Structures are given as C-alpha cells and as structure tokens.
Design an enzyme around this catalytic site. Structure first.
Site, PDB file in Angstrom:
ATOM      1  CG  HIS A  43     -69.110  -1.098  -7.160  1.00  9.60           C
ATOM      2  ND1 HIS A  43     -69.594  -0.440  -6.059  1.00  9.60           N
ATOM      3  CD2 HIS A  43     -69.219  -2.436  -6.892  1.00  9.60           C
ATOM      4  CE1 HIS A  43     -69.966  -1.332  -5.134  1.00  9.60           C
ATOM      5  NE2 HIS A  43     -69.761  -2.513  -5.625  1.00  9.60           N
ATOM      6  CG  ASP A  99     -69.943   2.923  -6.371  1.00 11.00           C
ATOM      7  OD1 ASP A  99     -70.363   2.647  -7.512  1.00 11.00           O
ATOM      8  OD2 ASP A  99     -69.732   2.091  -5.469  1.00 11.00           O
ATOM      9  CB  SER A 198     -72.167  -4.388  -3.496  1.00 15.43           C
ATOM     10  OG  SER A 198     -71.411  -3.344  -4.014  1.00 15.43           O
TER      11      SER A 198
END
Lengths: 252, 9, 33
Positions: A43, A99, A198
């Site tokens: 992502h 992910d 992230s």
C-alpha cells in the site's frame, strides 16, 4: 509514532526511509534485509482508490538515518531502485490482505555502525514468539498525533493481542496473513503507529539466540492511539515463501 | 527537508 | 535468518551493550534467555 520515544543512535539499523523525489517527501518506512533488498508494505506503492501508484523512478531510499529532515552528511546512504515487486494477491480492493512488497536496489549497500540488516523468522522462531502478551517494537518518523512531525526517529514497544479481540474491534474481515497489536483500555498504558510510519518493521528480540527478528510490517489501523482499537500488521512468516521465491528468481 | 547533494545521489 | 550477521547491532549486540528498553520485551517473553 504516538506516545513513543526518540530512538538511541544505532538502535534500529535496518530502518529505512521511503522518500519522494519531488515534491521531496517522506512516503513511508521500510526495512533492510540484505545489502540489496528492502521490505515495505504494498500500500505504500500502490493504492488505486487514491490514485496512488509509484514506479522505480519516483523514488529514493535513504539508509542510516536518525534525523527526519536533515541530510546526514557522512552517516546516511541514498539508494536508487532497480525493481519493485508487489505480491500478486495483494487485496487493495477490500482489506489490504497480503500488504507486502520487495525492493531491489541498483547497487549493494555497505554496512556500518548505522546500517545493518534484520533477520527473517524461521517457522520455529515464529512459533515461540508470536504470542498474545509478548511485546514487539515499532519505529518510524510518522505522525505523533492522530490529528506533529517528530525531529528524530521514534520508538514504541507494544504487546501482541489475541485474535478474537482483534476480530471484535473492527467491521473489517481479518485474515491469517494479519496480526493486531496494542494496549487495551483496561491496561491503561498506550501507543501506536501513525501516518507516515506505514511499512516499517514490527521486530522481536529472540531470547534463544539474542538476535533481532522482523515479524510484522506496519499495515493499517483506524485512527492512531484510539481506545478499544488496534494496529494491524502483515504477518511476515506467512509470506516467507513468496519472499524466498522472488529473491531466488530475481536476485541475490 | 534539507535538499540532498547532487553528490549523494 | 533475515540475512546472515543478521539482527546483531554493531552498537549494542556487537559490544554487549543493551538499549534502554529491550529488557521490557524480554521480561514479557516471560523473562528472556
């Protein structure tokens, strides 16, 4: 990181910054796994609902960093990307299942006091450490608040939470490729990953060989530090053959 | 964000 | 695993120095090594 602390120097030597060339900017975290491979979240590179879709060219990898903002004159190393590989079954359409993504650098990077790879878990390691109650560590230059930017690299220690509990906190469908982590409202102690964090590592230190292992990839959460809510991470041991396979086919 | 020296890239 | 000299820090593990909060992790694996 929300409610974390500044990292010591050489505390997380595998920590990598995913940096945008123009506008020059902090994209996400990542981790160094050898002298030519970097690991991050899919992502960070591809998110069609938001028109997000970066190629090799759009990016720069910065290794050996402590300060978020300063060019670290003889510490940090900047690398260019040779190829990007995303898991073929990464599910962006619904819960970000799988992910994960690999990054192959143009040239091998040299280790130093501030630059060093983390280990990838084996089945046995996964088996004894991935337990509810056991604490792991997250690092990053992300938001300090849900709704600023830290000056130096932040660190936080969080406990793995039981599956049911994870399942029970959201309306999203959780997969075996995921694990959730955080303090409970009862436990009154807190902290979480936040925007900009992230794709960095969730690491554990093995009590058997006193080695650092990367178990998770900072994946998704709802808010940052919300009571009754948890952070979700990509379960690295479950995607190990895919990783093993791309390195086998395209590299090392 | 300090710029990166053309000599780093 | 991860790599080969993997997960041993030149400023900690390499010199036998601990970081300020690693004892918090090990005591949770119900006291490490």
């Amino acid at each position: 990181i929300v409610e974390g602390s500044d990292a010591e120097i050489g505390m997380s030597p595998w920590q990598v910054m995913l940096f945008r060339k123009s506008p020059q900017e902090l994209l996400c975290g990542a981790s160094l796994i050898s002298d030519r491979w970097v690991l991050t979240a899919a992502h960070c590179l591809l998110y069609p609902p938001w028109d997000k879709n970066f190629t090799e060219n759009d990016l720069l990898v910065r290794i050996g960093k402590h300060s978020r903002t300063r060019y670290e004159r003889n510490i940090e190393k900047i690398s260019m990307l040779e190829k990007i590989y995303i898991h073929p079954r990464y599910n962006w359409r619904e819960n970000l299942d799988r992910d994960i993504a690999l990054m192959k650098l143009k040239k091998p990077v040299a280790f130093s006091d501030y630059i060093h790879p983390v280990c990838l878990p084996d089945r046995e390691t996964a088996a004894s450490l991935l337990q509810a109650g056991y604490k792991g560590r997250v690092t990053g230059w992300g938001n300090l608040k849900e709704t600023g930017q830290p000056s130096v690299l932040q660190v936080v220690n969080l406990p793995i939470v039981e599956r049911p509990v994870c399942k029970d906190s959201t309306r999203i469908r959780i997969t075996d490729n995921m694990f959730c982590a955080g303090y409970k409202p009862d436990e009154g102690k807190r902290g979480d990953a936040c925007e900009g964090d992230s794709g960095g590592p969730f690491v554990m230190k093995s009590p058997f060989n006193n080695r650092w292992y990367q178990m998770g990839i900072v994946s998704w959460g709802e808010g940052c530090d919300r009571d009754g809510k948890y952070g979700f991470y990509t379960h690295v041991f479950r995607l190990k053959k895919w990783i093993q396979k791309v390195i086998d086919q395209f590299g090392e | 964000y300090e710029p990166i020296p053309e000599e780093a890239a | 695993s991860g790599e080969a000299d993997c997960g041993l820090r030149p400023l900690f593990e390499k010199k036998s120095l601990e970081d300020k909060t690693e004892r918090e992790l090990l005591e949770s694996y119900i006291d490490g090594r």
